[PDB]
Write a protein that binds this ligand. Structure first.
Ligand SMILES: NC(=O)C1=CN([C@@H]2O[C@H](COP(=O)(O)OP(=O)(O)OC[C@H]3O[C@@H](n4cnc5c(N)ncnc54)[C@H](O)[C@@H]3O)[C@@H](O)[C@H]2O)C=CC1
Ligand SMILES: NC(=O)C1=CN([C@@H]2O[C@H](COP(=O)(O)OP(=O)(O)OC[C@H]3O[C@@H](n4cnc5c(N)ncnc54)[C@H](O)[C@@H]3O)[C@@H](O)[C@H]2O)C=CC1
Ligand SMILES: [Zn+2]
Ligand SMILES: [Zn+2]
Lengths: 360, 360
């Protein structure tokens, strides 16, 4: 026999300022709902969130996770599953709410995907990484031993609600961190987005993306990411523009734990790859100069001591397996476009590391 | 934004006698492949399997699991993931082989579904439960605490290879156990299949389904199950004929561990439900008599001491949550058809338990 079936996945990504008075957190839910919330968010937006739901007639239980990258593992997933069991979450008419950064929503997303083999949830990203990348995709997952995101699923939330108001309480470091993922999109897809960052990047960090440039920047980032994910949501096509900055960074992020945030590790990979592109003639000296200056302006690292030739080698090799025996490396071709290569040599990487070393 | 994407899942279910000389185990694979094999199967068919692959020019590493229901848990999944890591299984061009019963292939299936968020595998079911149910579906999963199959995914193997020759080495108990899942299909879908079992059931157990009735029986069982799974592969429709015998049995199976095999627990549920149907007028005294006689003839239990009114209650309640607040209970309407009910009362269940008690 052949069995063949089609699956329609569709989900919503909606910008909804002032989320916690009338706007639909209330009817994103409906009523009794389980809410899995990042500890620091709980401390910061808990009083307001609970006032919302009680006034809007919704009973709830907060499952609080103190979320960080080291504990982004299966045991934390079991903690969320425990909460679903004790709350009595039903098969599908009562979605679970994940409210936190990209660590939180990746964990709850994977718990929800496993629970009875699929359980609907809603995402409320509270960090910049969450709002323009981690909270709007289909990918979920956790680390397994020294391997980044080794275990996971494709399980988008049926709704993502983005309220840029949450970014107001981030510190400069995490604001910049999320700006790294926006720069990724810009460098290979969107020259105007790159321009907005160069022109406004400092102010956006200083103002924590509070307001109308920040609004434009967030809109294009999301639009950029979604154009890339929507037609390739389960990554049947393994050449992915969005893989830019993610060829070396997984091994680098894991080896430096906990010194580098995800976007910082991503930026090291982007700076390496941009130097690679330059050495190849795909980027001019002037353009390379433009990229590395936005990076220093966003106070983002271009290098780390974890980043030795051997680690860079091992990092690449782990990625070739992930990409099914191909490098499929996106290199920027000018600013706002990219090419996929499969002939990156260890020699080229060492030269590019030295070039970063003199810059840095 | 709305993101909407379509996913084409298709997979093959092929009957291939004499699997381990020329037939395609060889080109189900292609070469270097990881094989996860049930311990007892390894002891029984290992010498032949390795002789096959070496002669057919395929290098391999056996990951051996001593598989049983108590250890059908996530830690066993991590054992399989460990083996995938150390073997260096690539993203998708080298499928992993699962060769064992329904515990084995459920575990490897869930490991494969999680590994890099999806990894192809092939299934070779070696038990009757595997050949007509566990090895031909899309469902995978493991138990979480005292809950049956609480964690899992929809991830069919891209190929299932069924060789009835493997059934030759099962003992009578496990042959009957798998006959229970065939009876399930027959009671609600296939009167002719029911007839084949009543007419041949004893011989089929005695001959361990070795040969042409056994061939007909296996073919209709598979065909019956697949007609049910193919148009509802992710269970968007929660009224499922194949849920017959699976409303009480999960809690019963778990509470009696390790006294009841899966199909035996299923049969207790089928015998209870058939009595329920009878008390309702959906089954005649004669038909009820026909069903319970096939069950005694297959030496399958109709009752267990685990099966108290309170457990039966709790068991039903766990299922109503699983079915999103509905009972959606399939009751046989005559033999070879069924109706879905949502008005089963605790009173009716107690009466049916007493009726089983006098029979048993
Ligand atoms: N699934 C996907 O497609 C993607 C997943 N990711 C994952 O995202 C993860 C990192 O996400 P992040 O959000 O950067 O990390 P995070 O979840 O660890 O949060 C960063 C920090 O900010 C705090 N925080 C959160 N919201 C806050 C707020 N509004 N105000 C003040 N403090 C707040 C948290 O408590 C935490 O200390 C990585 O594990 C990365 O793999 C990244 C991109 C895509
Ligand atoms: N995913 C799905 O859609 C379904 C999954 N299942 C799962 O199947 C599991 C039970 O599967 P079973 O195969 O009954 O159990 P099993 O995998 O535990 O195997 C039963 C026993 O037979 C032995 N064995 C296997 N093949 C043999 C052979 N050819 N000769 C001799 N000994 C052999 C095994 O070592 C084991 O001791 C349950 O956990 C049930 O939930 C059942 C139906 C459907
Ligand atoms: Zn990233
Ligand atoms: Zn079953």
């Amino acid at each position: 026999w052949r069995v063949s079936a089609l699956k329609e996945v569709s989900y919503d990504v909606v910008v909804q300022p002032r989320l916690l008075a009338n706007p639909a957190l209330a009817d994103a839910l409906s009523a009794r709902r389980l809410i899995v919330i990042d500890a620091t968010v709980r401390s910061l937006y808990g009083e307001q969130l609970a006032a919302y739901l009680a006034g809007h007639d919704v009973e709830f239980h907060l499952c609080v996770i103190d979320a960080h990258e080291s504990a982004k593992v299966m045991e934390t997933v079991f903690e969320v599953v425990d909460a679903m069991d004790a709350f009595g979450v039903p098969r599908r008419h009562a979605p679970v709410l994940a409210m936190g950064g990209g660590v939180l929503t990746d964990i709850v997303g994977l718990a929800a995907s496993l629970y009875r083999r699929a359980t609907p949830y809603v995402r409320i990203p509270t960090t910049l990484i969450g709002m323009i990348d981690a909270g709007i995709g289909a990918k979920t997952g956790v680390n397994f031993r020294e391997h980044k995101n080794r275990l996971g699923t494709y399980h988008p939330s049926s709704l993502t609600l983005i309220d840029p108001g949450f970014l107001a309480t981030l510190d400069a470091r995490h604001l910049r961190n999320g700006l790294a993922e926006i720069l990724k999109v810009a460098l290979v897809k969107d020259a105007e987005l790159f321009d907005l960052l160069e022109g406004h990047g400092a102010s956006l960090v200083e103002q924590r993306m509070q307001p109308g440039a920040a609004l434009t920047v967030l809109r294009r980032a999301v639009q950029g990411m979604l154009e890339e994910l929507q037609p390739n949501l389960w990554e049947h096509q393994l050449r992915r523009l969005v893989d830019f900055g993610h060829s070396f960074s997984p091994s680098v992020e894991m080896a430096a734990l906990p010194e580098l945030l995800h976007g910082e590790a991503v930026c090291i990979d982007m700076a390496l790859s941009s130097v690679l592109a330059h050495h190849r003639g795909l980027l001019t000296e002037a353009e390379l100069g433009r990229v590395l200056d936005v990076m220093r302006l966003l106070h983002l690292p271009v290098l780390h001591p974890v980043c030795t030739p051997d680690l860079m080698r091992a990092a690449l090799a782990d990625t070739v397996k992930h990409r099914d025996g191909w490098q499929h490396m996106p290199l920027p071709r000018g600013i706002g476009d990219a090419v996929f290569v499969n002939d990156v040599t260890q020699r080229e990487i060492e030269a590019a590391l030295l070039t970063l070393a003199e810059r840095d």
